[PDB]
Write an enzyme that holds these catalytic residues in place. Structure first.
Site, PDB file in Angstrom:
ATOM      1  N   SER A   1       0.786  -1.244   0.000  1.00 27.72           N
ATOM      2  CA  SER A   1       0.000   0.000   0.000  1.00 27.72           C
ATOM      3  C   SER A   1       0.812   1.285   0.000  1.00 27.72           C
ATOM      4  O   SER A   1       0.239   2.366  -0.153  1.00 27.72           O
ATOM      5  CB  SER A   1      -0.982   0.033   1.149  1.00 27.72           C
ATOM      6  OG  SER A   1      -2.110  -0.752   0.835  1.00 27.72           O
TER       7      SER A   1
ATOM      8  N   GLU B   1      -4.677  -8.133  -6.570  1.00 23.97           N
ATOM      9  CA  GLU B   1      -3.586  -8.947  -7.123  1.00 23.97           C
ATOM     10  C   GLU B   1      -2.184  -8.399  -6.797  1.00 23.97           C
ATOM     11  O   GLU B   1      -1.241  -9.172  -6.607  1.00 23.97           O
ATOM     12  CB  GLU B   1      -3.753  -9.094  -8.638  1.00 23.97           C
ATOM     13  CG  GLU B   1      -4.971  -9.909  -9.062  1.00 23.97           C
ATOM     14  CD  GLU B   1      -6.268  -9.115  -9.003  1.00 23.97           C
ATOM     15  OE1 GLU B   1      -6.284  -8.038  -8.372  1.00 23.97           O
ATOM     16  OE2 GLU B   1      -7.280  -9.579  -9.572  1.00 23.97           O
TER      17      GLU B   1
ATOM     18  N   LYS C   1       2.999   6.464   5.038  1.00 26.04           N
ATOM     19  CA  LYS C   1       2.070   5.533   4.433  1.00 26.04           C
ATOM     20  C   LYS C   1       2.577   4.118   4.615  1.00 26.04           C
ATOM     21  O   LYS C   1       3.698   3.802   4.243  1.00 26.04           O
ATOM     22  CB  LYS C   1       1.893   5.822   2.946  1.00 26.04           C
ATOM     23  CG  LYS C   1       0.925   4.859   2.251  1.00 26.04           C
ATOM     24  CD  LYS C   1      -0.525   5.139   2.628  1.00 26.04           C
ATOM     25  CE  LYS C   1      -1.440   3.981   2.271  1.00 26.04           C
ATOM     26  NZ  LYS C   1      -1.394   2.881   3.282  1.00 26.04           N
ATOM     27  N   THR C   2       1.702   3.268   5.150  1.00 29.52           N
ATOM     28  CA  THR C   2       2.025   1.895   5.507  1.00 29.52           C
ATOM     29  C   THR C   2       1.702   0.960   4.352  1.00 29.52           C
ATOM     30  O   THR C   2       0.996   1.327   3.408  1.00 29.52           O
ATOM     31  CB  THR C   2       1.178   1.472   6.732  1.00 29.52           C
ATOM     32  OG1 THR C   2      -0.212   1.619   6.420  1.00 29.52           O
ATOM     33  CG2 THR C   2       1.490   2.380   7.894  1.00 29.52           C
ATOM     34  N   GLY C   3       2.263  -0.237   4.395  1.00 31.14           N
ATOM     35  CA  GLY C   3       1.713  -1.320   3.618  1.00 31.14           C
ATOM     36  C   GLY C   3       1.889  -2.660   4.279  1.00 31.14           C
ATOM     37  O   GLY C   3       2.687  -2.821   5.213  1.00 31.14           O
TER      38      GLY C   3
HETATM   39  C1  LIG Z   1      -3.083  -3.576   6.993  1.00 33.22           C
HETATM   40  C2  LIG Z   1      -3.285  -3.240   5.543  1.00 33.22           C
HETATM   41  C3  LIG Z   1      -2.823  -2.089   5.003  1.00 33.22           C
HETATM   42  C4  LIG Z   1      -1.868  -1.210   5.708  1.00 33.22           C
HETATM   43  O1  LIG Z   1      -1.588  -1.391   6.912  1.00 33.22           O
HETATM   44  O2  LIG Z   1      -1.319  -0.288   5.060  1.00 33.22           O
HETATM   45  N1  LIG Z   1      -3.146  -1.683   3.766  1.00 33.22           N
HETATM   46  C5  LIG Z   1      -3.965  -2.387   2.789  1.00 33.22           C
HETATM   47  C6  LIG Z   1      -3.128  -3.066   1.677  1.00 33.22           C
HETATM   48  C7  LIG Z   1      -1.852  -2.300   1.419  1.00 33.22           C
HETATM   49  O3  LIG Z   1      -0.793  -2.646   1.932  1.00 33.22           O
HETATM   50  N2  LIG Z   1      -2.841  -4.465   1.912  1.00 33.22           N
HETATM   51  C8  LIG Z   1      -3.599  -5.415   1.353  1.00 33.22           C
HETATM   52  O4  LIG Z   1      -4.620  -5.162   0.739  1.00 33.22           O
HETATM   53  C9  LIG Z   1      -3.108  -6.839   1.432  1.00 33.22           C
HETATM   54  C10 LIG Z   1      -3.244  -7.370   2.833  1.00 33.22           C
HETATM   55  C11 LIG Z   1      -2.272  -7.854   3.702  1.00 33.22           C
HETATM   56  C12 LIG Z   1      -2.822  -8.255   4.916  1.00 33.22           C
HETATM   57  C13 LIG Z   1      -4.201  -8.103   4.949  1.00 33.22           C
HETATM   58  S1  LIG Z   1      -4.864  -7.427   3.491  1.00 33.22           S
HETATM   59  S2  LIG Z   1      -5.120  -3.471   3.572  1.00 33.22           S
HETATM   60  C14 LIG Z   1      -4.033  -4.257   4.713  1.00 33.22           C
END
Ligand SMILES: CC1=C(C(=O)O)N[C@@H]([C@@H](C=O)NC(=O)Cc2cccs2)SC1
Length: 256
Positions: free
Chosen positions: A39, A135, A201-203
């Site tokens: 993300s 994806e 910004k996290t991911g």
């Molecule tokens: C927890 C999380 C974040 C975040 O902390 O930034 N963003 C979203 C996205 C981006 O990294 N990740 C996903 O959609 C895939 C996932 C991993 C674990 C759960 S959903 S949704 C999952």
């Protein structure tokens, strides 16, 4: 090494790059190792959106349906009937990591390949957007689609937020959204003293990938731009936020 130790403690691989924009001092550890960007790409995506639109143009309302919602839609799932403006979608993507909001924004700027091209245009030859949610979060070791490196993410975040890929008014929007992120309190923020302003910004993605990219403003002086990326060897691995917070403490000491 302290970063080695953290990899040992958390059975994970770390990618770190930090630049003190005041002194050009850097901290690096596997800075050119690829990870799934997950993300964190949302931040650069709003970068491109801002470049391509006037601020007033962000008030364009986007109509969408259930079909546009994907796996994680904290804000977008509430507004199917009204739609949301581009400005509201940027807020949702950046502050809540709303995946549908990112997909909708990506479509408005011409899709992953268009995003790639605009990133090349600002000097980033590393970051490789290819896919939509969901994806893009499935990246197997050794594949390059939807990956970047700590160095490239820092260089690109800096370019948009702090340099001249955007005019001041748009930089301010971007920085304010990232400063009021709700998703990052356990990561880079948790390695930085309370009261220092942090834009992040996290991911999170498969193979226990757990990332955070940030700008940190120290008690006066120029800001630091930092990417902390991680991944683990098993596809269903859990992550631990504490790795990112501890890595951030190591960076701050090494710059101090
Ligand atoms: C927890 C999380 C974040 C975040 O902390 O930034 N963003 C979203 C996205 C981006 O990294 N990740 C996903 O959609 C895939 C996932 C991993 C674990 C759960 S959903 S949704 C999952």
């Amino acid at each position: 090494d302290d970063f080695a130790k953290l990899e040992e403690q958390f059975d994970a691989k770390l990618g770190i790059f930090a630049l003190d924009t005041g002194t050009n001092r850097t901290v690096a550890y596997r800075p050119d190792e690829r990870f799934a960007f997950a993300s964190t790409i949302k931040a650069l995506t709003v970068g491109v959106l801002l470049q391509q639109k006037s601020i007033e143009d962000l008030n364009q309302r986007i109509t969408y349906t259930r079909d546009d919602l994907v796996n994680y839609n904290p804000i977008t799932e509430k507004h199917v009937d009204t739609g949301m403006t581009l400005k509201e979608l940027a807020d949702a993507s950046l502050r809540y990591s709303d995946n549908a909001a990112q997909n909708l924004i990506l479509k408005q700027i011409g899709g992953p390949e268009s995003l790639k091209k605009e990133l090349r245009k600002i000097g980033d030859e590393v970051t490789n957007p290819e896919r939509f949610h969901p994806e893009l979060n499935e990246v197997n070791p050794g594949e390059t689609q939807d990956t970047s490196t700590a160095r490239a993410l820092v260089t690109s975040l800096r370019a948009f937020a702090l340099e001249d890929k955007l005019p001041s008014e748009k930089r301010e929007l971007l920085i304010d959204w990232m400063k009021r992120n709700t998703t990052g309190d356990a990561l880079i923020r948790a390695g930085v003293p309370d009261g220092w302003e942090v834009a992040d910004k996290t991911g999170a993605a498969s193979y226990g990938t757990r990332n955070d990219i940030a700008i940190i403003w120290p008690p006066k002086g120029d800001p630091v731009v930092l990417a902390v990326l991680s991944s683990r060897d098993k596809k269903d691995a859990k992550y631990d936020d504490k790795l990112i917070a501890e890595a951030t403490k190591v960076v701050m000491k090494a710059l101090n």
